[PDB]
């Protein structure tokens, strides 16, 4: 029920803390 | 102080209609305001006066500049006024209808001077009809009109 | 010959004939103008007919609704007198809308009345429902128990499936033949 | 005063069968046509004897006699698609009846229903009644749980189903009940909400329910 | 000629003849001017007609609207007595606007009413819908569910598809031949 | 010749004949002056029209608008009681403006009502729409869904393209030939 | 010559003849004096004319404007009821001005209304427009849609080109020839 | 009078056929004219017996007979494009019937339909019925998920479909169901709301949905 | 009274053709003139028999017969400019019938249409049907997206188009559906709220990357 | 015959409202297995109210008496 094919992060008006914490696994 | 204000406003209407205030151009209205104070304080009472200011700190914490939200404030005065008129509804209709009923007898007997007679009889009538619904009708509206904490969202919002 | 009820209404008269024909006694309906209807029987069936009057509580009372005891003609109207007339028009309209379903002959629905939750600081309670139904025979009445629960679920604010209780049955055996006249 | 004119205008929904015990038989199709004919015979404009038969009534009428005189019998359904020669669907892997006493059953069944000329006994398989019942419930992509046990299986459909999967699953069972009967395989469709309605729990062999962030409940191992 | 019922009006009489003809009996609709209508059947049909009167609860009651309990002729009207008259006019418009779809013959729509929001400061809750329908037979009624829930979704503030429930069915089999008079 | 209905007005009588003519039976439109109209059919064609009167719920009720519940002649009008007429007059004017397109014969639009977000301090919610339409046949009715959305999108303050749902269909087959009298 | 309608309007009778003459059936406009107009059709064309009555929803309602249920005769007028009467006169005057352009036969214009901003704490939002138009055929109607948006651009405070939507179309085929009487 | 004058003025929509069981069958085309013809035989202006047949109603009557005398049969539909010589679409990859037992079926089917003269049985393939349905579902640009199993496949359509996809879906299923029928392949349209509207999320192998700046949701794999 | 006098005054918008089964065919040009002629034969001012044909529905009458007796056939449309010699547009690169069994189809298509004399068969090419739809879509300068697959292609027109981009796209498709029909190529005009008209990109460490075409689009906050 | 528990004092004071109790009586047609008829009524009576439990309802039921169909008889003397 999550219709996308690839891999990646979609950000809709994040506050630069929940954005950069999501890059903390790569 | 909403239901105490209309109750103090209630007693001033019944005081003003019966005479007794025409020395301007009151003790009775003080009596109802004390009475609704005690019957509010007994069942619960003070538990709901502290709860609305404990929740007020959860939605109006300072260094955030919350305001009292002007556009629903502008109907506050008629909101207690329409609660004032319907609470003073039944006793002003009988006193007014009795006067013109007396006035039709002055048209039937010309030198009665029913204005003088109107002052002697109205203070007993204006208090008697309100004794019938004093017991079952007044004290529950006092508890109904107590402002509760659930409506705290509609009067405020923080600005940043 | 002997009378047993008189002065009935139209719908009270039609109920007495339909019960006695189930129990093999034949009665007669005679109109009397402005004094309502009247119901007579024969001579030997009179002793048994009074026995069925006592059990079935004839004549039937008029059915009672909750909006009858809080009339709108009163110039005052408390909020306990407004939610009760609001609930009483919903619990007749859902039952009358239930009669347009597939195979239902009769139904009766009840709603929970909540009036004292708004006067104090207490939160409003959840709302419960219950329904009855009589189905036409030949129906698999184990599979028709989930469409009434689905329709009645989100016709209100927020119910669960435990608060809805529907118990239903198949119709009785049909009475179609005449009683027969007692000859002597 | 013939009987076929006493019925409706269209002579295609009824079919009159002459019985062997001086009684005519009218075979209807549904409950509505049985009441159309039972009103005719109840008012009494036919001086001889006649009876109206059905499929749901006749399949429950000759099972009271069969559940008294021939108990523990494994059968499926009696079809009256040709009313002069019905077909009895007997099971194969659950009986121990020989060839000789099956003619006794085909003669003690013919005398209780007078309109049938002969009864045919076919042995239906038992696992092919559930493999078509599983494949049809799999085409609708519905969640189920099969429970195999001795002498009958049980398919359990629970949860919060939506509006299309209840109509499509109610249209499938009655088309299965129409052809197989409700003796062997039973459908149990049950609509209930999320059990443990809003509580977090730790399932499996050591279970506990959390009434609150600081409250534990220990029922049966979830 | 045993008389069954008298005094019915125009819309009540046309439902009685449509039910009795399903069970192979015919009636006569005799006009009486100011006293409404009247319905008589024969004597061998009298025993059967009184059986179907009690089961189908005939005569039908007139259908109830919530706006009848709160008249617009009052002097002052509360906000509780205004959202009940507002919500009652949309749901009468929503089932007449459902008849202009293809295939549909009848519909009934119910809305969840808000009661506590008029006197309290609580925010209102989500609104739940439920609908009934009768479709002309032969239609692929499985693919017909996705249009009514889509149409009913964005006719309000914010609903979701688990809070809308549609339970629909095809109409019954057609009755096209005359019952036939009972000769005896 | 048995009578079905009487007392109907002008607009009702041309709909009852238009439904019976779909089902191969004749009808006569009889006037009665100020007492409305009446309709009579023949005796062999009486059993079919009673079955179709109950199903299509004929005669039709007059179509209800929300402006009929709030008349302008009241002495006091709330702000809650004035937006309801305002919402129910824009809802009719876009319906009369959609009929001027190429191929549309009938249409009905429903606006999402919001009334409780005005007196309070909450911001007003987004507005949702839902429209129906009927096109003449022979048209590519899948490509004409994009300009009805384009016309209604910037007719309000701020809507999106997914809070509006248009469900449309083509008209039925033309009935041009006579029903035909029963031969006796 | 069976009758169809009566009690119509001068413009309502000029509309009934214009629909039937598109569909190859004739009519007779018999005047009744003070009652109004009345349409009687021939007997073989009676079945087809009834079918076109149900589809086109005839007789036509009078076209509604928003300033018809907020009349200017009352002694007091809210600011909510004063911007809606101002806005209801611009979109009528803009319609009278749009028909005098080069090629426009008819048009209809809607403006986004403002309700809550009189009392809510928000300043008023931008204006959104929507327009329809019917052009005489032979016109290169892809280039005409940019001359109406320029005219509609600076008819408000500050609107953009995205809040104006113009959907226009060439006119239909001409109906010029007579229907033809049935040979009876 | 004879039957073809007792119907309407348009003598083109019905075609009467004389039966073998001393009847006369009329072959309508939809449910709107069958009630027109059944109104005629019900009011009673005809002396002998007659019936009104249909494409879909007769396609359910002779399927009730077939699942009583011949169970576990793999077929799709009987086509009634010419009502005097119908064509029966039998499956190929799911049955083991020889030529000798196909003539008993084609001679016992003639006695159930007295209006027909012969039945022409052809063995259709099983992969082309699902290859035109899958390729027909990509042309409408719809997201789907095929689940294969033995003796039937099914296509489930999910998501927040807009108004053009729930009109192209009905115009495609009814054109495919009209040809093949719903015996082998069945569609299941179910529509849910999007959990991702104003939310930020990471997609791929370790997918999660941030329902708030401080609230994570780990979904099912 | 002959046939072409009972119709309207202008005797050139219709076209009366003699049939072979002793009937008489009238050839209208649109759905408006179809109801003009059908009112004549319904009101009953003509003694003999007559039928009404049409371009959009006679292409449907012999496509219902065609997808029963000849499945897996690739064709586009039948043009009826001269009704005594219709033209059938087959596919060249997707049809594998020889010359002997193509002449059987023309004599079998003759029996469905009793007004026609001989149906002409030509083999249209399959990439020319896609080149006219592509070069005609670039000529209007419309942002589109092509999806190639086996047995038909499809073109999607997404985005938040304005009124001119809708009017040019809607006008070209209806002048294209007339010629080739919608059996092979389907158009997918849809309005969504994104200012980026169809396309989608992901951005990391080198620039932008054009994503594969999918159904989900990002809603645009601007 | 059904009876409901009445509450008066709790609606005015700070005391919480009490639980709700139900009790029902019934006269059944004879020939019925009236031990199994007691569970549908408690299932019906539970969620026809706000908050009741299954042990605050008590059903007491009995089959009807034998029918009286014959005439008494006139006293001859």
Tab-separated table of N, CA and C in Angstrom, chain G residues 39-147:
chain	number	residue	atom	x	y	z
G	39	UNK	N	-49.890	23.341	-24.550
G	39	UNK	CA	-49.344	22.588	-25.672
G	39	UNK	C	-50.117	21.290	-25.856
G	40	UNK	N	-50.684	21.107	-27.045
G	40	UNK	CA	-51.392	19.888	-27.409
G	40	UNK	C	-50.640	19.269	-28.578
G	41	UNK	N	-50.336	17.978	-28.482
G	41	UNK	CA	-49.645	17.268	-29.548
G	41	UNK	C	-50.579	16.250	-30.191
G	42	UNK	N	-50.146	15.719	-31.334
G	42	UNK	CA	-50.917	14.703	-32.026
G	42	UNK	C	-50.819	13.365	-31.295
G	43	UNK	N	-51.715	12.456	-31.658
G	43	UNK	CA	-51.825	11.155	-31.004
G	43	UNK	C	-50.712	10.151	-31.340
G	44	UNK	N	-50.233	9.996	-32.590
G	44	UNK	CA	-49.070	9.114	-32.785
G	44	UNK	C	-47.768	9.653	-32.222
G	45	UNK	N	-47.642	10.957	-32.017
G	45	UNK	CA	-46.424	11.532	-31.465
G	45	UNK	C	-46.496	11.687	-29.958
G	46	UNK	N	-47.481	11.060	-29.323
G	46	UNK	CA	-47.678	11.214	-27.891
G	46	UNK	C	-46.680	10.417	-27.073
G	47	UNK	N	-46.264	9.256	-27.564
G	47	UNK	CA	-45.338	8.427	-26.805
G	47	UNK	C	-43.941	9.020	-26.804
G	48	UNK	N	-43.522	9.563	-27.942
G	48	UNK	CA	-42.200	10.162	-28.042
G	48	UNK	C	-42.117	11.481	-27.287
G	49	UNK	N	-43.200	12.256	-27.281
G	49	UNK	CA	-43.167	13.560	-26.630
G	49	UNK	C	-43.161	13.431	-25.118
G	50	UNK	N	-43.761	12.366	-24.597
G	50	UNK	CA	-43.724	12.111	-23.165
G	50	UNK	C	-42.315	11.723	-22.738
G	51	UNK	N	-41.600	11.004	-23.603
G	51	UNK	CA	-40.251	10.558	-23.276
G	51	UNK	C	-39.275	11.723	-23.232
G	52	UNK	N	-39.453	12.705	-24.104
G	52	UNK	CA	-38.571	13.857	-24.072
G	52	UNK	C	-38.918	14.824	-22.950
G	53	UNK	N	-40.126	14.732	-22.397
G	53	UNK	CA	-40.477	15.525	-21.224
G	53	UNK	C	-39.739	15.053	-19.975
G	54	UNK	N	-39.650	13.736	-19.768
G	54	UNK	CA	-38.986	13.209	-18.576
G	54	UNK	C	-37.485	13.465	-18.610
G	55	UNK	N	-36.889	13.420	-19.796
G	55	UNK	CA	-35.446	13.578	-19.901
G	55	UNK	C	-35.027	15.022	-19.671
G	56	UNK	N	-35.659	15.963	-20.355
G	56	UNK	CA	-35.243	17.351	-20.226
G	56	UNK	C	-35.793	18.068	-19.003
G	57	UNK	N	-36.472	17.370	-18.074
G	57	UNK	CA	-36.933	17.948	-16.799
G	57	UNK	C	-37.900	19.107	-17.006
G	58	UNK	N	-38.654	19.072	-18.079
G	58	UNK	CA	-39.560	20.166	-18.359
G	58	UNK	C	-40.776	20.117	-17.439
G	59	UNK	N	-41.384	21.278	-17.126
G	59	UNK	CA	-41.127	22.677	-17.504
G	59	UNK	C	-39.919	23.306	-16.810
G	60	UNK	N	-39.265	24.265	-17.470
G	60	UNK	CA	-38.041	24.844	-16.906
G	60	UNK	C	-38.340	25.729	-15.717
G	61	UNK	N	-37.516	25.599	-14.687
G	61	UNK	CA	-37.613	26.503	-13.566
G	61	UNK	C	-37.126	27.888	-13.985
G	62	UNK	N	-37.579	28.936	-13.299
G	62	UNK	CA	-37.003	30.265	-13.526
G	62	UNK	C	-35.568	30.290	-13.038
G	63	UNK	N	-34.701	30.974	-13.787
G	63	UNK	CA	-33.287	30.947	-13.447
G	63	UNK	C	-33.050	31.762	-12.190
G	64	UNK	N	-32.238	31.225	-11.321
G	64	UNK	CA	-32.071	31.786	-9.995
G	64	UNK	C	-30.855	32.688	-9.972
G	65	UNK	N	-30.941	33.715	-9.142
G	65	UNK	CA	-29.801	34.549	-8.837
G	65	UNK	C	-29.687	34.587	-7.325
G	66	UNK	N	-28.490	34.915	-6.848
G	66	UNK	CA	-28.251	34.867	-5.413
G	66	UNK	C	-28.920	36.039	-4.715
G	67	UNK	N	-29.081	37.157	-5.410
G	67	UNK	CA	-29.705	38.325	-4.809
G	67	UNK	C	-31.227	38.258	-4.801
G	68	UNK	N	-31.813	37.092	-5.042
G	68	UNK	CA	-33.257	36.961	-5.015
G	68	UNK	C	-33.784	36.521	-3.660
G	69	UNK	N	-32.945	35.929	-2.815
G	69	UNK	CA	-33.364	35.534	-1.480
G	69	UNK	C	-32.705	36.368	-0.394
G	70	UNK	N	-31.981	37.417	-0.766
G	70	UNK	CA	-31.549	38.460	0.157
G	70	UNK	C	-32.063	39.798	-0.357
G	71	UNK	N	-33.345	40.090	-0.170
G	71	UNK	CA	-33.915	41.304	-0.753
G	71	UNK	C	-33.497	42.553	0.006
G	72	UNK	N	-33.448	43.662	-0.734
G	72	UNK	CA	-33.013	44.960	-0.233
G	72	UNK	C	-34.117	45.763	0.445
G	73	UNK	N	-35.207	45.130	0.852
G	73	UNK	CA	-36.303	45.859	1.465
G	73	UNK	C	-36.244	45.858	2.984
G	74	UNK	N	-35.396	45.026	3.580
G	74	UNK	CA	-35.328	44.933	5.030
G	74	UNK	C	-34.645	46.155	5.633
G	75	UNK	N	-35.033	46.459	6.870
G	75	UNK	CA	-34.547	47.653	7.548
G	75	UNK	C	-33.103	47.497	8.004
G	76	UNK	N	-32.646	46.266	8.229
G	76	UNK	CA	-31.272	46.001	8.629
G	76	UNK	C	-30.721	44.956	7.665
G	77	UNK	N	-29.412	45.021	7.416
G	77	UNK	CA	-28.715	44.127	6.506
G	77	UNK	C	-27.328	43.857	7.062
G	78	UNK	N	-26.971	42.581	7.193
G	78	UNK	CA	-25.651	42.248	7.687
G	78	UNK	C	-24.594	42.551	6.631
G	79	UNK	N	-23.331	42.689	7.042
G	79	UNK	CA	-22.250	42.754	6.053
G	79	UNK	C	-22.059	41.466	5.276
G	80	UNK	N	-22.490	40.320	5.814
G	80	UNK	CA	-22.462	39.094	5.028
G	80	UNK	C	-23.486	39.158	3.908
G	81	UNK	N	-24.617	39.788	4.177
G	81	UNK	CA	-25.713	39.945	3.238
G	81	UNK	C	-25.562	41.181	2.367
G	82	UNK	N	-24.477	41.934	2.525
G	82	UNK	CA	-24.241	43.093	1.682
G	82	UNK	C	-23.143	42.906	0.661
G	83	UNK	N	-22.191	42.022	0.910
G	83	UNK	CA	-21.233	41.722	-0.138
G	83	UNK	C	-21.791	40.731	-1.145
G	84	UNK	N	-22.691	39.849	-0.705
G	84	UNK	CA	-23.304	38.906	-1.630
G	84	UNK	C	-24.295	39.567	-2.575
G	85	UNK	N	-24.899	40.684	-2.182
G	85	UNK	CA	-25.765	41.382	-3.119
G	85	UNK	C	-24.979	42.283	-4.051
G	86	UNK	N	-23.784	42.695	-3.651
G	86	UNK	CA	-22.961	43.467	-4.565
G	86	UNK	C	-22.365	42.544	-5.611
G	87	UNK	N	-21.888	41.385	-5.169
G	87	UNK	CA	-21.274	40.424	-6.069
G	87	UNK	C	-22.289	39.787	-7.008
G	88	UNK	N	-23.550	39.723	-6.605
G	88	UNK	CA	-24.568	39.145	-7.469
G	88	UNK	C	-24.981	40.065	-8.602
G	89	UNK	N	-24.661	41.344	-8.511
G	89	UNK	CA	-24.918	42.256	-9.608
G	89	UNK	C	-23.749	42.445	-10.554
G	90	UNK	N	-22.528	42.110	-10.151
G	90	UNK	CA	-21.447	42.215	-11.121
G	90	UNK	C	-21.478	41.061	-12.118
G	91	UNK	N	-21.742	39.834	-11.665
G	91	UNK	CA	-21.764	38.711	-12.591
G	91	UNK	C	-22.998	38.690	-13.479
G	92	UNK	N	-24.006	39.511	-13.197
G	92	UNK	CA	-25.066	39.668	-14.178
G	92	UNK	C	-24.727	40.758	-15.178
G	93	UNK	N	-24.099	41.836	-14.709
G	93	UNK	CA	-23.727	42.919	-15.607
G	93	UNK	C	-22.569	42.504	-16.499
G	94	UNK	N	-21.692	41.638	-15.992
G	94	UNK	CA	-20.624	41.100	-16.820
G	94	UNK	C	-21.168	40.154	-17.877
G	95	UNK	N	-22.283	39.488	-17.587
G	95	UNK	CA	-22.900	38.637	-18.593
G	95	UNK	C	-23.550	39.449	-19.699
G	96	UNK	N	-24.173	40.569	-19.349
G	96	UNK	CA	-24.727	41.444	-20.371
G	96	UNK	C	-23.624	42.073	-21.201
G	97	UNK	N	-22.450	42.251	-20.608
G	97	UNK	CA	-21.358	42.852	-21.342
G	97	UNK	C	-20.646	41.819	-22.198
G	98	UNK	N	-20.684	40.546	-21.796
G	98	UNK	CA	-20.031	39.522	-22.596
G	98	UNK	C	-20.754	39.184	-23.886
G	99	UNK	N	-22.068	39.380	-23.958
G	99	UNK	CA	-22.756	39.051	-25.201
G	99	UNK	C	-22.518	40.068	-26.300
G	100	UNK	N	-21.964	41.226	-25.981
G	100	UNK	CA	-21.712	42.224	-26.998
G	100	UNK	C	-20.322	42.113	-27.587
G	101	UNK	N	-19.585	41.057	-27.262
G	101	UNK	CA	-18.296	40.854	-27.895
G	101	UNK	C	-18.480	40.272	-29.293
G	102	UNK	N	-17.375	40.145	-30.016
G	102	UNK	CA	-17.429	39.697	-31.402
G	102	UNK	C	-17.436	38.177	-31.431
G	103	UNK	N	-18.622	37.591	-31.551
G	103	UNK	CA	-18.763	36.158	-31.730
G	103	UNK	C	-19.455	35.430	-30.600
G	104	UNK	N	-19.644	36.053	-29.446
G	104	UNK	CA	-20.230	35.358	-28.309
G	104	UNK	C	-21.739	35.319	-28.475
G	105	UNK	N	-22.316	34.127	-28.381
G	105	UNK	CA	-23.767	34.065	-28.413
G	105	UNK	C	-24.372	34.065	-27.015
G	106	UNK	N	-23.745	33.364	-26.074
G	106	UNK	CA	-24.205	33.323	-24.692
G	106	UNK	C	-23.022	32.960	-23.811
G	107	UNK	N	-23.134	33.316	-22.537
G	107	UNK	CA	-22.059	33.092	-21.588
G	107	UNK	C	-22.639	33.022	-20.186
G	108	UNK	N	-21.828	32.535	-19.251
G	108	UNK	CA	-22.204	32.480	-17.843
G	108	UNK	C	-20.932	32.587	-17.016
G	109	UNK	N	-20.937	33.475	-16.025
G	109	UNK	CA	-19.752	33.776	-15.231
G	109	UNK	C	-20.048	33.566	-13.750
G	110	UNK	N	-19.128	32.895	-13.066
G	110	UNK	CA	-19.173	32.668	-11.629
G	110	UNK	C	-17.943	33.262	-10.961
G	111	UNK	N	-18.155	33.842	-9.787
G	111	UNK	CA	-17.104	34.452	-8.987
G	111	UNK	C	-17.063	33.739	-7.644
G	112	UNK	N	-15.861	33.560	-7.103
G	112	UNK	CA	-15.740	32.930	-5.796
G	112	UNK	C	-16.218	33.873	-4.704
G	113	UNK	N	-17.170	33.407	-3.911
G	113	UNK	CA	-17.777	34.231	-2.883
G	113	UNK	C	-17.016	34.171	-1.569
G	114	UNK	N	-17.181	35.230	-0.785
G	114	UNK	CA	-16.514	35.398	0.497
G	114	UNK	C	-17.608	35.472	1.551
G	115	UNK	N	-17.527	34.605	2.553
G	115	UNK	CA	-18.576	34.504	3.561
G	115	UNK	C	-17.983	34.759	4.933
G	116	UNK	N	-17.041	33.911	5.324
G	116	UNK	CA	-16.571	33.873	6.697
G	116	UNK	C	-15.660	35.040	7.026
G	117	UNK	N	-15.097	35.708	6.014
G	117	UNK	CA	-14.087	36.732	6.251
G	117	UNK	C	-14.673	38.013	6.824
G	118	UNK	N	-16.000	38.134	6.871
G	118	UNK	CA	-16.600	39.294	7.493
G	118	UNK	C	-16.436	39.239	8.995
G	119	UNK	N	-16.452	38.032	9.560
G	119	UNK	CA	-16.379	37.822	10.997
G	119	UNK	C	-15.156	37.036	11.452
G	120	UNK	N	-14.592	36.168	10.611
G	120	UNK	CA	-13.371	35.465	10.986
G	120	UNK	C	-12.180	36.413	10.978
G	121	UNK	N	-11.115	35.990	11.651
G	121	UNK	CA	-9.917	36.792	11.722
G	121	UNK	C	-9.035	36.805	10.500
G	122	UNK	N	-9.514	36.350	9.386
G	122	UNK	CA	-8.614	36.373	8.257
G	122	UNK	C	-8.905	37.556	7.346
G	123	UNK	N	-7.879	38.107	6.705
G	123	UNK	CA	-8.112	39.043	5.610
G	123	UNK	C	-8.660	38.271	4.425
G	124	UNK	N	-9.388	38.910	3.514
G	124	UNK	CA	-9.962	38.154	2.392
G	124	UNK	C	-8.935	37.661	1.379
G	125	UNK	N	-9.222	36.484	0.836
G	125	UNK	CA	-8.336	35.746	-0.059
G	125	UNK	C	-8.457	36.270	-1.486
G	126	UNK	N	-7.700	35.696	-2.419
G	126	UNK	CA	-7.826	36.095	-3.826
G	126	UNK	C	-9.108	35.571	-4.462
G	127	UNK	N	-9.391	36.119	-5.638
G	127	UNK	CA	-10.607	35.859	-6.404
G	127	UNK	C	-10.326	34.851	-7.509
G	128	UNK	N	-11.226	33.887	-7.674
G	128	UNK	CA	-11.119	32.855	-8.696
G	128	UNK	C	-12.307	32.975	-9.647
G	129	UNK	N	-12.044	32.843	-10.949
G	129	UNK	CA	-13.058	32.996	-11.985
G	129	UNK	C	-13.241	31.750	-12.845
G	130	UNK	N	-14.430	31.648	-13.444
G	130	UNK	CA	-14.781	30.548	-14.336
G	130	UNK	C	-15.805	31.043	-15.349
G	131	UNK	N	-15.576	30.746	-16.629
G	131	UNK	CA	-16.422	31.265	-17.696
G	131	UNK	C	-16.720	30.204	-18.749
G	132	UNK	N	-17.936	30.252	-19.298
G	132	UNK	CA	-18.352	29.457	-20.447
G	132	UNK	C	-18.820	30.384	-21.561
G	133	UNK	N	-18.758	29.906	-22.806
G	133	UNK	CA	-19.139	30.727	-23.954
G	133	UNK	C	-19.516	29.828	-25.124
G	134	UNK	N	-20.431	30.309	-25.968
G	134	UNK	CA	-20.817	29.593	-27.182
G	134	UNK	C	-20.602	30.465	-28.422
G	135	UNK	N	-19.773	29.976	-29.341
G	135	UNK	CA	-19.351	30.711	-30.524
G	135	UNK	C	-20.058	30.220	-31.780
G	136	UNK	N	-20.260	31.143	-32.715
G	136	UNK	CA	-20.726	30.792	-34.049
G	136	UNK	C	-19.648	29.978	-34.759
G	137	UNK	N	-20.062	28.944	-35.491
G	137	UNK	CA	-19.109	28.033	-36.107
G	137	UNK	C	-18.400	28.705	-37.283
G	138	UNK	N	-17.256	28.136	-37.662
G	138	UNK	CA	-16.367	28.773	-38.609
G	138	UNK	C	-15.309	29.664	-37.993
G	139	UNK	N	-15.311	29.818	-36.684
G	139	UNK	CA	-14.424	30.646	-35.871
G	139	UNK	C	-13.200	29.848	-35.448
G	140	UNK	N	-12.000	30.416	-35.527
G	140	UNK	CA	-10.837	29.718	-34.965
G	140	UNK	C	-10.786	29.860	-33.452
G	141	UNK	N	-11.521	28.970	-32.793
G	141	UNK	CA	-11.863	29.081	-31.384
G	141	UNK	C	-10.759	28.654	-30.426
G	142	UNK	N	-9.541	28.417	-30.890
G	142	UNK	CA	-8.430	28.244	-29.970
G	142	UNK	C	-7.749	29.545	-29.588
G	143	UNK	N	-7.847	30.555	-30.432
G	143	UNK	CA	-7.262	31.857	-30.174
G	143	UNK	C	-8.188	32.826	-29.463
G	144	UNK	N	-9.487	32.550	-29.442
G	144	UNK	CA	-10.420	33.439	-28.768
G	144	UNK	C	-10.365	33.356	-27.249
G	145	UNK	N	-9.786	32.296	-26.684
G	145	UNK	CA	-9.813	32.129	-25.232
G	145	UNK	C	-8.815	33.002	-24.494
G	146	UNK	N	-7.889	33.628	-25.198
G	146	UNK	CA	-6.954	34.541	-24.572
G	146	UNK	C	-7.431	35.979	-24.582
G	147	UNK	N	-8.479	36.289	-25.326
G	147	UNK	CA	-9.008	37.639	-25.294
G	147	UNK	C	-10.070	37.827	-24.227
